[PDB]
Write a protein that binds this ligand. Structure first.
Ligand SMILES: Nc1ncnc2c1ncn2[C@@H]1O[C@H](COP(=O)(O)OP(=O)(O)OP(=O)(O)O)[C@@H](O)[C@H]1O
Ligand SMILES: Nc1ncnc2c1ncn2[C@@H]1O[C@H](COP(=O)(O)OP(=O)(O)OP(=O)(O)O)[C@@H](O)[C@H]1O
Ligand SMILES: [Cl-]
Lengths: 172, 173
């Protein structure tokens, strides 16, 4: 169930939303704009509301699904850090338990696809990503995971994050 | 000390940010985009990051600074409702205690200037705007307002919004 068609021209990815998804067009544009101050989203080049088209930087890399088993704890911690950033910012990207196509890995790490984003006081980017990570790497038992995730969600502060971070990385 | 120059071509306001305020260009673009589903912001037409330009709908109306003392309580209540809507959405627009130039009034009510916005769990749109209103209309003592605004921030649900809305409007001439 897709909301858009993405084509590539030169160095740009052009995402054209179907007309029934104008709502998602604007959230994609909005959250990409609000995240330009950081290095973990594509550069945004243009919006065209009449065509529901967003033109942005094409990110060269591998999607997380193709290399998840080869990522070192270095790189996993950098991804966890980005999720924590989104949590702190108030942006619930959604589908972070299925980031398969939406984390692009090279020398850098870039997230794509913000069209389902919503603003939330306590987003679920880290906890959703943790579920995906445990499903793919089988780092621990679900109950142990929910213990750590309930601890982070209750505290939702840097201390609670640093504890959860090191605890996920230790299972690697 | 402004962050931009705004010019008008046809029915469009074109806001061009100075290069030192690229950061604010993106917040203006972002929050206008996130608010296009609502009718109280300009339509956004285009962004040009190389020029730090945003092209948007020109809003015809009178700025609130020019009509505040003549606005009726129904109209004030509509403005309060828009501040509440931003509160519920999580968008702190900032400078709502100096909205003089940034609320444009006609048959409709439209807010402009989101370049200083920030996401917050409990924004201060309504609480800042209440201070502007008390400064211009002299509704009550500063201490009374401050109690009412803390009660709103403590509750922050629809019922406690309605209470603060009523408490503010009841004092109007
Ligand atoms: N900036 C980009 N750089 C590189 N590849 C991109 C970029 N944007 C999109 N793509 C590619 O295009 C695909 C489709 O884009 P995207 O994932 O944003 O939408 P989708 O999930 O297919 O559709 P929707 O979310 O609208 O239902 C991505 O999975 C990715 O392979
Ligand atoms: N969409 C619009 N429709 C009509 N007039 C507009 C619009 N956008 C801006 N203006 C006019 O241009 C003026 C300047 O724009 P704006 O206040 O957004 O930016 P600014 O002068 O850089 O302010 P600040 O530095 O406080 O952000 C406004 O006070 C208003 O008179
Ligand atoms: Cl009246």
């Amino acid at each position: 169930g897709r909301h858009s068609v993405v084509r590539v021209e030169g160095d740009r990815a052009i995402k054209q939303f179907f007309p029934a998804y104008r709502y998602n067009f604007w959230k994609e544009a909005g959250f990409l704009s609000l995240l330009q101050e950081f290095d973990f989203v594509p550069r945004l080049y243009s919006i065209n509301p009449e065509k529901l088209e967003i033109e942005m930087e094409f990110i060269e890399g591998r999607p997380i699904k193709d290399v998840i088993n080869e990522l070192n704890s270095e790189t996993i911690g950098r991804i966890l850090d980005i999720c924590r950033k989104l949590d702190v910012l108030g942006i619930q990207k959604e589908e972070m338990n299925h980031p398969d196509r939406h984390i692009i890995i090279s020398d850098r790490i870039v997230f794509i696809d913000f069209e389902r984003g919503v603003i939330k006081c306590r987003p679920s980017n880290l906890t959703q990503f943790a579920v995906y990570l445990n499903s793919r790497l089988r780092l621990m038992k679900n109950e142990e995971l929910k213990k750590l995730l309930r601890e982070y969600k209750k505290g939702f502060d840097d201390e609670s994050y640093r504890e959860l971070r090191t605890q996920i990385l230790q299972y690697m």
